Amino acid sequence: MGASQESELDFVPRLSFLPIEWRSIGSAFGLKDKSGAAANGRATFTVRQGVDAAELTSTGRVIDGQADVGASLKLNTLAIGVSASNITFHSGLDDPTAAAAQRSSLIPSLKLTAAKQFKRDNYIAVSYDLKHQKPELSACWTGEAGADRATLLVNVDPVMRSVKLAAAVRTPGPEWRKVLYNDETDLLEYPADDGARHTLYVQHEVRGRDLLHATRLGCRLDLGRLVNYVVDFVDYRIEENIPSFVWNVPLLPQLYSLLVPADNDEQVRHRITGWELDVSHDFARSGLLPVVAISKTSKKLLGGGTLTASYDAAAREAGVSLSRKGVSVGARVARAEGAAGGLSAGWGRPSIHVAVEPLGLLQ
Amino acid sequence: VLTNTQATLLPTDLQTKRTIKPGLIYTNSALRKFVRNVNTRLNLKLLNSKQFIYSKRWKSIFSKIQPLQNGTTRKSYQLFRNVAKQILVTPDAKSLKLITINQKLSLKERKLLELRTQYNNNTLVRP
Amino acid sequence: AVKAARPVLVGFVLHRVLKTLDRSRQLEYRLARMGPEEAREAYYEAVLGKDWKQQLQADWDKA
């Protein structure tokens, strides 16, 4: 119950990896009615205490606000859409980092897009940005096959010769439950569904003659399914192969009883739910260092609130985030580069960011 | 002449362009030949185009009993496991614990059992 | 092991996307997503051709 009208192209809660115009097209074709107009938005706010890049002294506070706005309307089958993306609002004084981010930001742009639903859940679009006046073509194919669901998105621009692909699969993944046979009623018994799933996504961007210019990949795993699968494999294929003398050391069979318990009727050994693990990594960024987050989607805390603890090794940053329905209060802390030799790598710079969708605030 | 119970079994709007001799044997022969012809056409068209069941009771029984809580049942399990791995387990089977709870069903029997489960849960000339 | 395991993972995700997307558009899920009567014609459109009424009439006349 409580199924919201989410984007049919977006998969991941609390994470966005699509262009805003395609999210507006997917939200416009997600209407229950056969005609109507839709609107969508994103915003993010960064607050911190400003640290100067030269003398490492605190100068003030830097607040930045970035915005994405999309609007579309739908005819009998087509959609027309106008979007305003990547508008940056900057507050702060005497900061070279703010100016360097302003030079290297996503530019505030306005876009027209004329989208045709050429097949059911198969869409094609031609968009054309107005401020930079550049045209590009795009295609999207989404599909549902019982348990799993896939989405592929292609964006081709002949001006910069940029080819972008996005791809995602939500699938239950590996299964450990058995199809039982009832000896009394002469019928099979299939395992019931859980609703939890593993998400795999890839982004692949080519800019110019660099045929592998950028590639990012991400994997999101339910922890309970993985732990129960591992415990089932150990109990059914490994336990009979352990040599006998292993059990004669003290406390080891009891420890194996705590870690691997007995099997039951619903065929789960450990009742773990709501915990989830995110591993995301990009290849164009140097060093090949992962971004690892653990998340709890607790129902009792503010109505399905997600508490997230994250680490990135490239920026040496840790994060504590509270999220609910597109609202995200994330306090991240940065381990600075320590002094030249001996016990000087401490934690400074708390920074609070707020992500919001104001049209998702009405739910 | 064919009865009402037969008339709702075959797909409708079939026209009969010929007079058949009266009697039940001729009607049943014509329907039987019709079923044969439709199945032949379906299989020709299909050829011109381009799962381990386990037992609930035995799994519950073998999960209910525990070895390893003391050395006595552990040693009984070790002795049985040695002899059973020597003579009872066939090479294509992957585990002794897996085949002691496997319901050893043939391919056609498990296909028919899937079909009957699908019937109890919820073509052309099958009825 | 970067140059060996990187395109393996990339091609694994892309192949899983392609073989989920292709496996979501065949007979049974489409027939699951329509109502029963038009399912009864669409079954015949798949397994018997376009003019399935004429083919059943030829089988009946041969009988």
Curated annotation (Swiss-Prot), chain B:
Cellular compartments annotated: Plastid, Chloroplast membrane
Superkingdom per UniProt: Eukaryota
Functional description taken from the UniProt entry: Essential for cell growth. May be involved in binding chloroplast DNA to either the chloroplast envelope or the thylakoid membrane.
Family: Belongs to the ycf78 family.
Name used for this protein in its record: Uncharacterized membrane protein ycf78
Gene name in the database record: ycf78
Interval of the full protein contained in this chain: 537 to 682 of 1995
